[PDB]
Coordinates of C-alpha atoms and ligand atoms in Angstrom, one line a residue:
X7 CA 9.0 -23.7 -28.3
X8 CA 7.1 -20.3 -29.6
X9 CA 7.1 -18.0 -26.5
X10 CA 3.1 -16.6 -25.8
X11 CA 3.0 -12.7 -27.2
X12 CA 2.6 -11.9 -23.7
X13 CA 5.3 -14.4 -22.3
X14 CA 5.6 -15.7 -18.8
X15 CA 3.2 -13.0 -17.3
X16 CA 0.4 -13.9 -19.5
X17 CA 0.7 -17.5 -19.1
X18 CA 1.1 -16.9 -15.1
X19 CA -2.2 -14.8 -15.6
X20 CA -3.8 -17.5 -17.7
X21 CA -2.9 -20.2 -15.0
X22 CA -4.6 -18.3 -12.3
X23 CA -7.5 -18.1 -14.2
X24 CA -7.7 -21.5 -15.3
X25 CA -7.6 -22.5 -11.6
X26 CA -10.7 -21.7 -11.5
X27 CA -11.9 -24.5 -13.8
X28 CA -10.6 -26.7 -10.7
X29 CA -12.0 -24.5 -7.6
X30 CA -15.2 -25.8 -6.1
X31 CA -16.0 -22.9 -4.8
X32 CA -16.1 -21.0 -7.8
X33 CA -18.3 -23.1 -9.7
X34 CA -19.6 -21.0 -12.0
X35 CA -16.1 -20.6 -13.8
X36 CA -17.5 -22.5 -17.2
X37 CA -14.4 -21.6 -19.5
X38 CA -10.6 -20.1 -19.6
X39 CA -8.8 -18.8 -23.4
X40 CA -6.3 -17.5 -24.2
X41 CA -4.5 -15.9 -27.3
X42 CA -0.4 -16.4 -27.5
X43 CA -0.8 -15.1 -31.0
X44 CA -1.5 -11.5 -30.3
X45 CA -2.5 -9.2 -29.4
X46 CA -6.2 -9.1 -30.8
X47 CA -8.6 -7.2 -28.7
X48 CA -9.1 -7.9 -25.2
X49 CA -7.9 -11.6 -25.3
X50 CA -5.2 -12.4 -24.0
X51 CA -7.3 -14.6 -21.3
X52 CA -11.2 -14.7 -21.4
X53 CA -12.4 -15.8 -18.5
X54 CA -16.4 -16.9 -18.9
X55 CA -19.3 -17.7 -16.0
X56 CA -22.3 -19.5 -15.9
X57 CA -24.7 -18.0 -14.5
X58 CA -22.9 -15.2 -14.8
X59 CA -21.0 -13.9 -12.0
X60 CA -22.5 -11.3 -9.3
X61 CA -21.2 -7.5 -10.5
X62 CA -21.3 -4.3 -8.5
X63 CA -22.9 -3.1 -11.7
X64 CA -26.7 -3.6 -12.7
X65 CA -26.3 -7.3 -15.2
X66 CA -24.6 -10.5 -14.0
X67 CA -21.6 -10.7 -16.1
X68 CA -20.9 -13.6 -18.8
X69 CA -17.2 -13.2 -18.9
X70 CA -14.5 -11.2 -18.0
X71 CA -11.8 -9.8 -20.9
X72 CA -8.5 -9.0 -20.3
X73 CA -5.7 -7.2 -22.5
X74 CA -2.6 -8.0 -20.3
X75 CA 0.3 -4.6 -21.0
X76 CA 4.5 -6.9 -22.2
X77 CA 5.9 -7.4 -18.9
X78 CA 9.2 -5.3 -18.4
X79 CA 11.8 -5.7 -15.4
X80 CA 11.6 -1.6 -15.2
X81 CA 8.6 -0.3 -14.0
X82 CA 7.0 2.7 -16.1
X83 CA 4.2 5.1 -16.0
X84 CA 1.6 5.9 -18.3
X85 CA -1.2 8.4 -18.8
X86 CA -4.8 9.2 -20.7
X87 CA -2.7 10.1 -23.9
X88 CA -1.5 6.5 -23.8
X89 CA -4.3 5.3 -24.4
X90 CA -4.6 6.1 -28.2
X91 CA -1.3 5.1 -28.9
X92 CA -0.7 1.7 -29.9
X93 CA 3.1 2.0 -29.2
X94 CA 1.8 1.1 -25.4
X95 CA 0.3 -2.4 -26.4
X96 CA 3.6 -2.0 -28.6
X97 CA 1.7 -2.9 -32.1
X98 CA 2.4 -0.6 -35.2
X99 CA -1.6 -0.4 -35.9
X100 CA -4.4 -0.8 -33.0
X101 CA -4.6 1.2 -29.6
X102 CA -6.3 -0.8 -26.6
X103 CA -9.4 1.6 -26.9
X104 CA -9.4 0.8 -30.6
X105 CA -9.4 -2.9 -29.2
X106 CA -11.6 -1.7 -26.8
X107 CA -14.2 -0.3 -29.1
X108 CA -13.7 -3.5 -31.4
X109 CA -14.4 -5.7 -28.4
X110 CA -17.8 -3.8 -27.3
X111 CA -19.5 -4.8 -30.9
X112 CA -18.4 -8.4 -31.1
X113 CA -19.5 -9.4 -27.7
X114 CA -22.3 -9.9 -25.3
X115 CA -23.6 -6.5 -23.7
X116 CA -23.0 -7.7 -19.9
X117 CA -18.9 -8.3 -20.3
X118 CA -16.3 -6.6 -18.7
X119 CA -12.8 -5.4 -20.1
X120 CA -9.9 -4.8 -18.0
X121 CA -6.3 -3.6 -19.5
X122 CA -3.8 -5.2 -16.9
X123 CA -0.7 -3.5 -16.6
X124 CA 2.1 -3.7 -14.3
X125 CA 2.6 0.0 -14.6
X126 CA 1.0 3.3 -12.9
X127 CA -1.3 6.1 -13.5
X128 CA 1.6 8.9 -14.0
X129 CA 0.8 11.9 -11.1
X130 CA -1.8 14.1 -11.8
X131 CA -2.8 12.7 -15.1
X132 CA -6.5 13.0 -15.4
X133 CA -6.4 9.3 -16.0
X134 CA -6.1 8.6 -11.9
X135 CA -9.2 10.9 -11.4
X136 CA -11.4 8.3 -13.8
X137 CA -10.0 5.3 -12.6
X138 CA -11.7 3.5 -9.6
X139 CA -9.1 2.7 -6.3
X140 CA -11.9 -0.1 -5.8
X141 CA -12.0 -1.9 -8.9
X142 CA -10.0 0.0 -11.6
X143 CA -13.5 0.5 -13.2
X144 CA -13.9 3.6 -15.4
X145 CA -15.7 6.3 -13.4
X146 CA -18.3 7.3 -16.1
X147 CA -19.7 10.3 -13.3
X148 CA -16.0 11.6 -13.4
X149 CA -15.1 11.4 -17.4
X150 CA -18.7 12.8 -18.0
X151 CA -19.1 16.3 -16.2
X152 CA -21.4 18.1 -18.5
X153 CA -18.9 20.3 -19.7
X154 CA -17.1 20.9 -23.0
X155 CA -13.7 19.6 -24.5
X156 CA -12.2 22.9 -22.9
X157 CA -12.3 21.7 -19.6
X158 CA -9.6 19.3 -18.0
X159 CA -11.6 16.0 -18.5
X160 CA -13.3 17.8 -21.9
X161 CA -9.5 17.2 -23.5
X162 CA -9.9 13.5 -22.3
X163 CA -13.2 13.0 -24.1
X164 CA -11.9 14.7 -26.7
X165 CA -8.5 13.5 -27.6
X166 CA -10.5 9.5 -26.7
X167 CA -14.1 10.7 -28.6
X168 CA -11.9 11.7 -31.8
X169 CA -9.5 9.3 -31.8
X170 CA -12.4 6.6 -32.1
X171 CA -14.1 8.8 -34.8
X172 CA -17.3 8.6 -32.9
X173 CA -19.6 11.9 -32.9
X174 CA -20.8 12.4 -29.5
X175 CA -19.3 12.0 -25.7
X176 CA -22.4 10.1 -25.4
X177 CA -21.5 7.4 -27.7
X178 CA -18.1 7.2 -26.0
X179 CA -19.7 7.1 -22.5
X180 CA -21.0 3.6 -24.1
X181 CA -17.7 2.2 -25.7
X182 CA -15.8 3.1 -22.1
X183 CA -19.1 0.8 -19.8
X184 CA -17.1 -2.1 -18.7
X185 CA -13.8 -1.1 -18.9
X186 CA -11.3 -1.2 -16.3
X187 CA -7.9 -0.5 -16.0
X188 CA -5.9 -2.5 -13.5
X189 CA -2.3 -0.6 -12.8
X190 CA 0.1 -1.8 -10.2
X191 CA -0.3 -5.2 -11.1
X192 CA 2.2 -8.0 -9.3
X193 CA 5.6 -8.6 -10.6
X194 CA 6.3 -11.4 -13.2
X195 CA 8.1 -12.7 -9.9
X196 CA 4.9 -12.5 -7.6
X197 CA 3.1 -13.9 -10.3
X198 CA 5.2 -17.1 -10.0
X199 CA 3.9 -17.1 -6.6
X200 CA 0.0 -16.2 -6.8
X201 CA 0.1 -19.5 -9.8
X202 CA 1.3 -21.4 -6.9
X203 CA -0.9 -20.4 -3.8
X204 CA -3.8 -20.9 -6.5
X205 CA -2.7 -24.9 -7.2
X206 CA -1.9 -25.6 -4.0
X207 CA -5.6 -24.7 -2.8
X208 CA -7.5 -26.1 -5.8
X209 CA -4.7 -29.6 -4.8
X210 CA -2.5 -29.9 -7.4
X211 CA 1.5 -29.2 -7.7
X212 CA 3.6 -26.6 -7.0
X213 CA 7.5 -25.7 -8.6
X214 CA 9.5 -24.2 -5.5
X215 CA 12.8 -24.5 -5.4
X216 CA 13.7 -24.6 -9.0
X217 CA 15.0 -20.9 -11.3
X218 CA 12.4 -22.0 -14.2
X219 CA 9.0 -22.6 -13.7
X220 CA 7.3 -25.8 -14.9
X221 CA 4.1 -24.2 -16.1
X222 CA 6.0 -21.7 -18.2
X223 CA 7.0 -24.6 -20.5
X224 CA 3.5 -26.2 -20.0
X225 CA 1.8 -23.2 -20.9
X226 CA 3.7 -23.1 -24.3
X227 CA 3.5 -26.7 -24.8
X228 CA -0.4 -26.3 -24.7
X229 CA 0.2 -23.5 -27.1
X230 CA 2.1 -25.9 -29.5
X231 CA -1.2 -28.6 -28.8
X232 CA -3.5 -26.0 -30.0
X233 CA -5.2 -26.1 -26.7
X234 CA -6.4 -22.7 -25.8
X235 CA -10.1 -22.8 -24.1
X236 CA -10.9 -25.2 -21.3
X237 CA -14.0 -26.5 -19.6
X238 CA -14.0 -27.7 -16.1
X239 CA -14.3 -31.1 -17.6
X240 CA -11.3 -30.4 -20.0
X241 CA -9.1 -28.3 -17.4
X242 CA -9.4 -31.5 -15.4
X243 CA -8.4 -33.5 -18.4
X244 CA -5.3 -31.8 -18.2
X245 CA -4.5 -31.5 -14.7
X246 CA -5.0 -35.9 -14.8
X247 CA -2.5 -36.1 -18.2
X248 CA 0.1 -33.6 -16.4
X249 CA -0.1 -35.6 -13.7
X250 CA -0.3 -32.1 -11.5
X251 CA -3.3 -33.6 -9.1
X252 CA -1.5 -34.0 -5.6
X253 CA -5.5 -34.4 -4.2
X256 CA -8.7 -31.6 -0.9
X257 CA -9.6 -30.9 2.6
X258 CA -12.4 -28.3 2.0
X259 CA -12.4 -24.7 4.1
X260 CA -15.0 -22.0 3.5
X261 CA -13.0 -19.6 1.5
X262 CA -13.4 -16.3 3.8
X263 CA -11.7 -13.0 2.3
X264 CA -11.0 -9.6 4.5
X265 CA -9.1 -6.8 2.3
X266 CA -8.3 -3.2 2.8
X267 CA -6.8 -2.3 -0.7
X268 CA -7.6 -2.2 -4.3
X269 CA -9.6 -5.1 -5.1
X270 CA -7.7 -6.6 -8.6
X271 CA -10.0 -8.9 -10.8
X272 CA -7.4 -12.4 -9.6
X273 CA -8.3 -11.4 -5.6
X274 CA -11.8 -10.3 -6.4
X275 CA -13.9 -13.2 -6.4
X276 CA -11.5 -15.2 -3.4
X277 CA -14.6 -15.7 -1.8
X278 CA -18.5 -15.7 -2.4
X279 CA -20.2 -11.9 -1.4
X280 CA -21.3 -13.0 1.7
X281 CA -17.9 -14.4 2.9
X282 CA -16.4 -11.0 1.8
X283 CA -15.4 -8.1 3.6
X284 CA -13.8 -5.4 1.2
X285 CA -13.2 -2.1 3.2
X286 CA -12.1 0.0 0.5
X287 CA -15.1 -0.1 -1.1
X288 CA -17.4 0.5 2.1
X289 CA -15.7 3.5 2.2
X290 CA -16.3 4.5 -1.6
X291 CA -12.0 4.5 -2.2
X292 CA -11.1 7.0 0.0
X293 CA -9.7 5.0 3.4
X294 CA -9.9 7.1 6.7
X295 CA -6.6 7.6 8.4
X296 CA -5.9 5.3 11.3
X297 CA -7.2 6.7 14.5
X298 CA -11.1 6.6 16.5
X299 CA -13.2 5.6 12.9
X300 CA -11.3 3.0 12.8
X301 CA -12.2 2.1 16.3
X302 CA -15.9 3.2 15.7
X303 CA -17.0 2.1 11.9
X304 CA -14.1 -0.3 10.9
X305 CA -13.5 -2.7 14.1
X306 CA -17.4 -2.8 14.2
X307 CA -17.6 -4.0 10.3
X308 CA -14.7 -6.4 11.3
X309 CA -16.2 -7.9 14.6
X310 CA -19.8 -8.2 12.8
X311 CA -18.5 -10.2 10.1
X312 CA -15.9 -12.7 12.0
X313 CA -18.7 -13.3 14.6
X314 CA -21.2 -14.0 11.6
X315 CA -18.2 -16.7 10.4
X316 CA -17.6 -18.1 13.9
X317 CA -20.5 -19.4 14.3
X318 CA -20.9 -20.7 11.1
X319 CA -17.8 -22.1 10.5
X320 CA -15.5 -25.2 11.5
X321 CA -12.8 -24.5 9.3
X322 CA -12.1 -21.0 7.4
X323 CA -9.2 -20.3 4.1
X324 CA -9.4 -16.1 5.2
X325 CA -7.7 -14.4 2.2
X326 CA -5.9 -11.6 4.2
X327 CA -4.7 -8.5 1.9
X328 CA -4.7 -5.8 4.9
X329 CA -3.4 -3.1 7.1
X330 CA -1.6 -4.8 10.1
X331 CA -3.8 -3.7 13.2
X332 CA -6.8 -5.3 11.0
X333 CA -4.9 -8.5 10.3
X334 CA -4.6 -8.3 14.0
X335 CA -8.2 -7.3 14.8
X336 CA -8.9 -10.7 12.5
X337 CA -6.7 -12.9 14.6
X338 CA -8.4 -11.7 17.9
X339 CA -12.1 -12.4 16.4
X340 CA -11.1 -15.9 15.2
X341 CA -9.0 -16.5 18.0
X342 CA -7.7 -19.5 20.0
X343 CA -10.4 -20.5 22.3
X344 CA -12.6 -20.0 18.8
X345 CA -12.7 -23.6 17.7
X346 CA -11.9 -22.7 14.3
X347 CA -9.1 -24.4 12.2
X348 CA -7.4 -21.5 9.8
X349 CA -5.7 -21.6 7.1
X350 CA -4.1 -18.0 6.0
X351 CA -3.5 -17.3 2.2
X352 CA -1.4 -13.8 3.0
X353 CA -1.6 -11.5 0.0
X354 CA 0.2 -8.3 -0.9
X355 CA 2.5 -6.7 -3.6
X356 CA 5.4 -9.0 -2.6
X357 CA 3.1 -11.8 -3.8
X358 CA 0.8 -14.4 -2.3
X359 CA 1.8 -17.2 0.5
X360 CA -0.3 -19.6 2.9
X361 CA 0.3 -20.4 6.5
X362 CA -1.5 -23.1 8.7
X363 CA 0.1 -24.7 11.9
X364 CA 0.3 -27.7 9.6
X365 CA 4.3 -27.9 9.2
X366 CA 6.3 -28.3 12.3
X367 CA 9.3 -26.1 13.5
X368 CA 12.1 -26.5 16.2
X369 CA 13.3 -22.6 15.9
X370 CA 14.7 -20.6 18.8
X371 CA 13.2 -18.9 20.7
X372 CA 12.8 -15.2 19.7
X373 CA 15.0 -12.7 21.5
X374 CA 12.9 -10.9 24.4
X375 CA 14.7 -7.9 25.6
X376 CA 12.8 -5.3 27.8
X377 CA 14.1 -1.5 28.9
X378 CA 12.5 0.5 31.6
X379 CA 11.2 4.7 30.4
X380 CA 8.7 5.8 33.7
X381 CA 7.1 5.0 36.2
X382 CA 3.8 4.1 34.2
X383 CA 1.4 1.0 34.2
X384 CA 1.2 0.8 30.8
X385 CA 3.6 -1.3 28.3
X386 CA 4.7 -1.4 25.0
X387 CA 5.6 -5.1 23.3
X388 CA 7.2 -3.8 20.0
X389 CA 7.6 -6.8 17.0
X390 CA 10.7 -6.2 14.8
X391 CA 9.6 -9.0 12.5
X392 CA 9.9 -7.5 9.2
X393 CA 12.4 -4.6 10.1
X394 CA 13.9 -3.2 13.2
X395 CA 10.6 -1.1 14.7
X396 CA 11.7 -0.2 18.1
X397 CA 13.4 3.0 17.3
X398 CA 10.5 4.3 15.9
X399 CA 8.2 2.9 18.3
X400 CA 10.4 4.5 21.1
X401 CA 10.3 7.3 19.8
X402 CA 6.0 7.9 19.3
X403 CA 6.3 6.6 22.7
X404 CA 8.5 9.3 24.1
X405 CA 6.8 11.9 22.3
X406 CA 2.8 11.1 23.3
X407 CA 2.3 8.0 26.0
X408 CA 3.5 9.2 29.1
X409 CA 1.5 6.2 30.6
X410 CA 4.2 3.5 29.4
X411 CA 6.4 2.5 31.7
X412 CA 7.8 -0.3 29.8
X413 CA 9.3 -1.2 26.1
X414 CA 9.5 -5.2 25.4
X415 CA 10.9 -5.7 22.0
X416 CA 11.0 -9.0 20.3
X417 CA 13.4 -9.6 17.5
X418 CA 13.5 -13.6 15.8
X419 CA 16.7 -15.7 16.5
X420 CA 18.5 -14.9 12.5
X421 CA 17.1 -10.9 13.3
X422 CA 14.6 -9.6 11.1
X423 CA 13.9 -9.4 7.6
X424 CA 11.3 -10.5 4.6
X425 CA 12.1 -14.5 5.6
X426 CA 12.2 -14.3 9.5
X427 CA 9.4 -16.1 10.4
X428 CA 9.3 -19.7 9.1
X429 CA 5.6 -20.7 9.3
X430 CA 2.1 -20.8 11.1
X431 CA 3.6 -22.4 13.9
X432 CA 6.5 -20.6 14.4
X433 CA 4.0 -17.5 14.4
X434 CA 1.9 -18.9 17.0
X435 CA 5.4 -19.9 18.7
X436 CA 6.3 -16.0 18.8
X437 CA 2.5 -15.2 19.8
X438 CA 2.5 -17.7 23.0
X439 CA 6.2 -16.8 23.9
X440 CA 4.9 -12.5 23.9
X441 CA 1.8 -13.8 26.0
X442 CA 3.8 -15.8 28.7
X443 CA 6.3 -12.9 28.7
X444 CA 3.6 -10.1 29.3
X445 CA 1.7 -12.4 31.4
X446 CA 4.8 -12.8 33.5
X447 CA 5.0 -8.9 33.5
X448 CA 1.4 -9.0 35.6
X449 CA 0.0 -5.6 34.1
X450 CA -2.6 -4.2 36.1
X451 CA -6.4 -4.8 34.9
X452 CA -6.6 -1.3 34.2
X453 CA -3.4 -0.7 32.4
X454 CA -3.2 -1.3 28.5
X455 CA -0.5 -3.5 26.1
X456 CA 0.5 -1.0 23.2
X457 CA 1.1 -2.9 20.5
X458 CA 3.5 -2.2 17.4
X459 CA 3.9 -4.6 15.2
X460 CA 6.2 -4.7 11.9
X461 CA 5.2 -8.1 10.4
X462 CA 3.1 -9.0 7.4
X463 CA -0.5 -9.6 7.6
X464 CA -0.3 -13.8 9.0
X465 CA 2.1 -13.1 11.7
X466 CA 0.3 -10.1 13.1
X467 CA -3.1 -12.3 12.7
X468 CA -1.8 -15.1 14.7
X469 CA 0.0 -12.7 17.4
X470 CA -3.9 -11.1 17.3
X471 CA -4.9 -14.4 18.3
X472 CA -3.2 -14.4 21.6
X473 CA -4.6 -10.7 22.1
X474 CA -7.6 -12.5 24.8
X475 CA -4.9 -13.6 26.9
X476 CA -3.5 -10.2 27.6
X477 CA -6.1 -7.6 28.4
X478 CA -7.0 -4.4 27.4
X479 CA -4.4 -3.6 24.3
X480 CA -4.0 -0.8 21.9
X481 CA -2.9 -1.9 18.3
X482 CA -0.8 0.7 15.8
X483 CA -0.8 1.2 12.4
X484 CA 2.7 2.3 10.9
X485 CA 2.1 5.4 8.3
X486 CA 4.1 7.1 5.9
X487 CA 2.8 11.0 6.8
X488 CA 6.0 11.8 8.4
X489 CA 7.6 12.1 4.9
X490 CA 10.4 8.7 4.0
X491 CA 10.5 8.6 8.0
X492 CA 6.9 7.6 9.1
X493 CA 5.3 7.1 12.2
X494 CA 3.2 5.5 14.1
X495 CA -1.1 6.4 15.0
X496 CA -3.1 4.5 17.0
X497 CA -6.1 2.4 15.8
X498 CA -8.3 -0.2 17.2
X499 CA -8.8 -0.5 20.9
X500 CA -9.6 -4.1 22.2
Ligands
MG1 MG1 -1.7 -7.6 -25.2

């Protein structure tokens, strides 16, 4: 059949949203469009609320607009400049803030318009200085100094202001409300994997194992229909005629992020249920060391404790630096009589973990190495790469206390696959607790953790962090150039 405009990525995108239509917990999802025979102006998928949905912004907003940049295998880069050209959308006539512009007279005041690119902000372009890290919103204080087109946002205003033939800056401070660009955006091949994590939780299907994706087809079939909007009532129409239902077993949907919060993560769970660093700290994250310890663990502890004892059974959306993955897994911990299930998010795409599935893997390989006299020890977990150089090293260099290295490598050695699921986490966790345990620290003494592992591994290790006493975790940074090395954060 006729491909979409946008392809596989729009139709991934589209699914996603449309999940929605399906999610009980997101109720207030009322309708899902798209356009395959585009582009128009910011509709590639609508996605519509009722009420409308809760905003950072002053008005509850009726729907959500996206313009959704042809997917290409090579990543690019783009700047303010390329926003006038319509080359970019890759039309011969309209530019996305002609689109833009078009978009803000047809349609309700409180909407929101996001251009969703996998691309980035080229360095230094004034664009990255008026685009939010929080929510890709356009930073209206930032484009809008006061000044003249002379100064370095003044050419912004300008080249945007006359390009749209309006008069003023203050009439394009009003076309630009709303608008968001998203940059960065997961691969066509992540996207695969967000459609499926999002059907699995709403109870329907999933396509694993094949090379071509079932809903690919499906989406163009639906094309082909004429079907392009759907209710709840008529996304569940579908799901029945597909035959796609599998079921669900419901969780309070619980999300804790560190990182740019894109419009598909966003609304994961309800406001109250959220816990979104990034924007507590206005887009600028503090460097790991004490405010981590003194405003982040606080914020962390707070709001697990506030679920705890709320909560029989939590879905935490995890998109997070390691040590706070781990922080999580401690606050929720066994002993907590919580049942978990992780939805792991990141760039490499989205996957969920419970204990669920069984495993009969090895055990992991345990080898320890003597370096002082010291109390102290480190347990080092080469999960995702080989971290014990490294580790030995920041050791060496600044913790004269440790006495001890125990590394911890799986059976197969590490890499992205190494650990097979929830249980074979917790497997790892309970094997580094028996081991440490069986190393009798003294009380006084602290477990140095460092930790290469994605965010459910190092939450289910944090987990077993009761059992073993007065620990420091470390977050892995990239300020030692390509190299990196490790800071301390949280202190338990
Ligand atoms: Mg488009």
């Amino acid at each position: 059949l006729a491909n979409w405009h946008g392809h596989d990525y729009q139709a991934r995108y589209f699914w996603i949203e449309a999940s929605r239509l399906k999610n009980p917990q997101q109720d207030f999802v009322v309708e899902v469009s798209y356009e395959a025979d585009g582009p128009k102006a910011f509709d590639d998928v609508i996605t519509r609320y009722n009420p409308p949905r809760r905003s950072t912004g002053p008005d509850r907003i009726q729907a959500d607009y996206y313009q959704i940049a042809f997917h290409v295998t090579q990543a690019a880069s783009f700047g303010f400049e390329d926003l006038i050209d319509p080359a970019f959308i890759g039309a011969e006539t309209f530019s996305i803030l002609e689109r833009l512009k078009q978009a803000k007279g047809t349609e309700p005041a409180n909407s929101a318009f996001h251009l969703v690119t996998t691309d980035r902000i080229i360095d230094e372009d004034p664009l990255g200085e008026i685009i939010s890290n929080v929510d890709g919103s356009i930073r209206l204080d930032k484009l809008f100094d006061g000044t003249t087109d002379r100064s370095r946002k003044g050419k912004v205003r300008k080249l945007w202001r006359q390009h749209l033939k309006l008069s003023t800056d203050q009439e394009l401070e009003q076309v630009l409300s709303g608008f968001h660009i998203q940059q960065s955006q997961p691969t066509l091949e992540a996207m695969r994997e967000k459609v499926n994590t999002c059907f699995q939780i709403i109870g329907l299907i999933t396509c694993e194992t094949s090379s071509d994706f079932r809903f690919d087809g499906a989406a163009r079939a639906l094309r082909s229909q004429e079907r392009y909007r759907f209710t709840r009532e008529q996304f569940t129409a579908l799901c029945e005629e597909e035959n796609w239902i599998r079921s669900p077993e419901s969780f309070r949907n619980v999300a804790l992020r560190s990182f740019s919060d894109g419009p598909l993560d966003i609304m994961d769970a309800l406001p109250e249920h959220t816990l979104s660093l990034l924007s507590l700290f206005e887009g600028r994250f503090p460097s790991p060391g004490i405010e981590w310890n003194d405003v982040i663990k606080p914020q962390v502890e707070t709001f697990l404790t506030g679920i705890r004892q709320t909560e029989r059974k939590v879905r935490l959306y995890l998109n997070t630096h390691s040590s706070i993955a781990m922080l999580a897994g401690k606050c929720l911990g066994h002993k907590s009589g919580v049942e978990i299930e992780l939805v792991q998010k990141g760039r490499m795409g989205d996957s969920i973990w419970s204990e669920n599935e069984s495993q009969d893997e090895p055990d992991a390989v345990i080898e320890t190495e003597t370096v002082g006299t010291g109390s102290d020890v480190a347990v080092v977990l080469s999960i995702t790469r080989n971290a014990l150089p490294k580790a030995r090293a920041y050791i060496l260099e600044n913790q004269p206390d440790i006495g001890r290295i125990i590394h911890v490598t799986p059976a197969n050695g590490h890499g992205q696959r190494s650990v097979k699921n929830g249980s074979h986490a917790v497997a790892i966790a309970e094997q580094v607790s028996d081991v440490v345990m069986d190393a009798d620290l003294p009380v006084e003494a602290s477990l140095h953790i460092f930790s290469a592992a994605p965010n459910a591994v190092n939450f289910y290790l944090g987990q077993h962090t009761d059992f073993l006493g007065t620990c420091v975790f470390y977050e892995f940074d990239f300020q030692r150039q390509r190299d990196g090395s490790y800071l301390p954060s949280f202190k338990v």
